[PDB]
Symmetry: C3
Subunit: 397 residues, 3 copies
């Protein structure tokens, strides 16, 4: 049975046939046609504070390095020396004056240009051997990248998102904490787990203290209560109302939290007393933003969290959660690290366990697609449709 | 060279060509056509003492859960939720009132029926989404399962075995100890090592204290001495005589132990003073039972041992040894754990080492089939014939 | 794209296209057509001091055992029992009277002949089941082996090398220390790193104390200074001048060390005060010898080092460094272990890091061949040409 036959018979209301989650062949397609073609969230721009600042990340097999150039611009490059291929930047992050390959010291300017290569002979044209660039966008303090030489349109999304994101002043953030975990499940299982709160009341004690179980929230017809919340927000100049991509790729919405909760904390109060951004009112709740296939996000009035999904192998996915707070917020004074992070560290561990347990069942040959819940899992259906549709376009001659 | 060509030129008196032991392609065939089609030993029924008792096990990629239902029946099921596939029972064993998937709490009755699924909408037919059953037989206190929807005939074997097994009262046993090890050799190498005692006098000091080296014993024309033993047994009402399957799949025989030995112990005396079953005479020796591809077994007058062979990968096999004793036998009083187990724990470690060393040599491209010993390894020849024959039937259009 | 197309478009002055370094398909070809067909360095003969001495090693999947026979001859054999395939010698090295398989004790004489096999029946012809021999050459105290039944010509190389090697009296050495490491890079990346000192001044602080950075040295038109050194050597009866194989497979040359340095030590003085061999003058420098695909070597006046390259997987290579000193040299008296070894232990660690970092960049799909330095990396070009040419001959119908 071919991939085309599997996609042809796929019905929208059901989880995917086994190979989509477990086969190396579908993983190769997901990499080639999804992760290698769409725009991807990489890191907050505040990680590249000073010029010479760099951060590295792997995308599938690609080795990418992101650096802040001399001119103040942020640029991305393939982290592979044009000489014999070596990684140039081995550390996760750092600062340098120049990009100097540790092998033979071919030296690049922070804009990728090869400015010195020892003893290469008279016929060497350095202009042909600068670092290969990687398409990059700055989404209001959040760095996105695209590995395709023919990137899809980012602008529609950026323009739609700017109003919602700019009120968080992400450019003025610092990273208060980063958590990187590996979940032993296909990247799609990670997203499907993320696009429903069908599993929340049983699996997320801490999260449920502040994050609503309403399917309307964590999922994908605006109710009265919700529109009322949108209104308080927007009356205060804080964009809030539902926005969904034409093609399902992204969604933004500022949702209310559980009664009285202001933030993702055990007591429900703000985690940080010096807010990141100018969100109003204090109880504006959480701006949810997703953008397939790479990222979901929770921007709160006091602090923000980005999540980055990166594929490791058919049955492994790296999830990186970044807590953003105001750059002048002081740990121990303006916030407490444990108190800031504990809820989502626990929620993440609980999701990992769940995803991995899901994956283990799926690996049984007895596993067959099952029906998603119309009322609790329409967001899951929504993601799978976007996924299949994307896969089909890419596979079309 | 195809599998059909390899099987076509195979001569019975020789070990198999390399790929049978080391290739992923033969492993896939062994799983599909052997482990997924034949009956397999799973666990003693005494592990499912109370209703709501369950135990889980993996067979190849299949995730199986075995549970004792409300009606006192023992049933097996695919351990994959009909919603989105998750394992329902994560622990190795436990008790529950209901099968409740930890993901979204789809809840099943202990007979597999879906009795509650949250918010699935009016068009949801729970009768279509009960757990998938797994064929199950109870062989006189030993649970066997078959992953095929068209199971082979178990009854011929069961009827032949009942007389030999029933005198052990396995229904009244408890598990005194379980040992699970992984041997780094193809599952067939584990069986070939098991079907001869050609290697015993050099590799098994402890075992050799009580278990005879006679090829007639551990192997596959009844001598005088042996028939005499069969006779003492059967004169005492204890079935003993050789039984071999028409097609070689199974064999039963109650063999004498080394002079004076009554059990698998360092001193040769009984391990347990409260016997499991009603075997007579005291020196009835050991009932050997094998059933390809899953199990060999030693039932003694005082206690019994089952062994379960499960494939992990082309070059890994899980062997699970279960010591059964009478349910009222008291550890520290009626038997001593170390004394009960030490012989076969050591024998198992020694076999693991041997199998792994065998496998390592076999992985050399220089390895070619070699001649089995007619007198010491006819049981090995017997197993390989059953194996090849099984493979050929399954491959026949 | 086929291997033939990749080889067809390959230009000599560039590093290889990705799959040569990372694909399982090229790894299978390298094993089949290179490592399994060419002569390979195994161990110094002094490791087989006494009769019954043996040493074992893996070559790709092949399991080889090398033993010193009763007649004083050194022979090699496939380390797989002719019965059911088991390794016969499990230890890395040892002594035995006979080769006795630990499984069923089939017993071989040290020349491979099967002299005893228990109970194999009247139709058993032991003459058909002796250990399979492995072609073996003794290169003046260095044991080489060839896994092909139709070995290439070793004699041209041996005759060319004898004059250079014999003055080191390798037959009179002992192993003072062995270091085995795994580098996470393709075996070709290990060689390319070895065939240039383009990376030396930045990566090898210790080595650079005594080993010259002149490309003429570590690389592949004899300058005045160098010929002068050749002359001092050969005037003293010590062969020194450049020898390169017709087909690029091997090279020998006795190069001068850094000003005043006599050996690979932190202080530059001799490591051992009792010299191995009769090299003269004291500052004769280092005899470099390479032989693709298995070995590079540094023979100094006081002691010698062999390096053995063996493939582990597409992206892993085992490098084994052996320090040879005179058999009567006494540790703690005639040399200090740390002082003898520290330079090349560090150099090796530094190379491992470099190779692994090279490999990591290469695994990016963005990696493309790049230009080798004509003046610093002609030795690299030389190795890659030998490699491609070898691969092409072997692939020719
Ligand atoms: O339970 C969680 O953690 C995520 C939040 C959005 C939907 N599910
Ligand atoms: O040696 C052993 O442990 C097994 C027992 C039956 C044949 N070989
Ligand atoms: O740097 C090193 O260690 C090796 C020596 C020969 C060429 N490169
Ligand atoms: S690989 Fe970067 S300088 Fe050689
Ligand atoms: S997977 Fe079992 S309830 Fe959703
Ligand atoms: S495998 Fe060597 S004696 Fe049986
Ligand atoms: Fe969750
Ligand atoms: Fe055994
Ligand atoms: Fe080096």
């Amino acid at each position: 049975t071919s991939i085309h036959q599997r996609l042809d018979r796929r019905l929208s209301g059901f989880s995917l046939e086994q190979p989509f989650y477990t086969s190396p062949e579908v993983y190769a397609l997901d990499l080639q046609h999804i992760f290698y073609k769409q725009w991807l969230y990489a890191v907050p721009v505040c990680q590249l504070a000073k010029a010479g600042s760099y951060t590295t990340l792997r995308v599938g097999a690609y080795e990418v390095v992101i650096v802040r150039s001399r001119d103040g611009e942020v640029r991305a490059f393939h982290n592979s020396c044009r000489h014999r291929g070596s990684l140039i930047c081995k550390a996760r992050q750092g600062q340098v004056a120049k990009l100097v390959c540790p092998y033979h010291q071919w030296t690049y300017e922070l804009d990728g240009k090869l400015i010195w290569a020892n003893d290469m002979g008279p016929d060497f044209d350095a202009s042909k051997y600068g670092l290969k660039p990687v398409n990059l966008r700055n989404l209001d303090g959040l760095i996105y990248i695209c590995l395709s030489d023919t990137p899809p349109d980012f602008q529609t999304f950026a323009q739609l998102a700017r109003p919602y994101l700019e009120v968080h002043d992400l450019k003025d953030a610092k990273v208060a904490f980063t958590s990187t975990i590996i979940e032993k499940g296909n990247w799609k299982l990670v997203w499907e787990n993320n696009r429903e709160c069908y599993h929340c009341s049983s699996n997320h004690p801490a999260l449920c203290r502040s994050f609503p179980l309403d399917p309307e929230v964590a999922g994908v017809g605006v109710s009265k209560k919700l529109q009322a919340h949108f209104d308080r927000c927007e009356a205060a100049g804080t964009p809030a109302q539902f926005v969904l991509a034409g093609d399902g790729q992204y969604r933004l919405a500022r949702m209310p939290l559980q009664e009285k909760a202001l933030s993702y904390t055990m007591d429900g109060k703000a985690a940080v007393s010096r807010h990141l951004g100018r969100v109003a009112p204090p109880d504006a709740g959480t701006l949810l933003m997703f953008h397939y296939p790479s990222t979901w996000n929770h921007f709160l009035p006091d602090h923000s969290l980005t999540f980055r999904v990166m594929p490791i192998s058919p049955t492994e996915t790296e999830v990186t959660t970044t807590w953003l707070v105001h750059k002048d917020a002081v740990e121990g004074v303006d916030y407490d690290l444990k108190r800031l992070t504990e809820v989502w560290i626990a929620t993440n561990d609980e999701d990992r366990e769940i995803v991995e347990t899901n994956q283990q069942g799926i690996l049984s040959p007895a596993y067959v697609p099952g029906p998603y819940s119309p009322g609790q899992e329409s967001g899951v259906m929504q993601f799978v449709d976007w996924y299949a549709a994307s896969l089909e376009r890419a596979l079309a001659p």
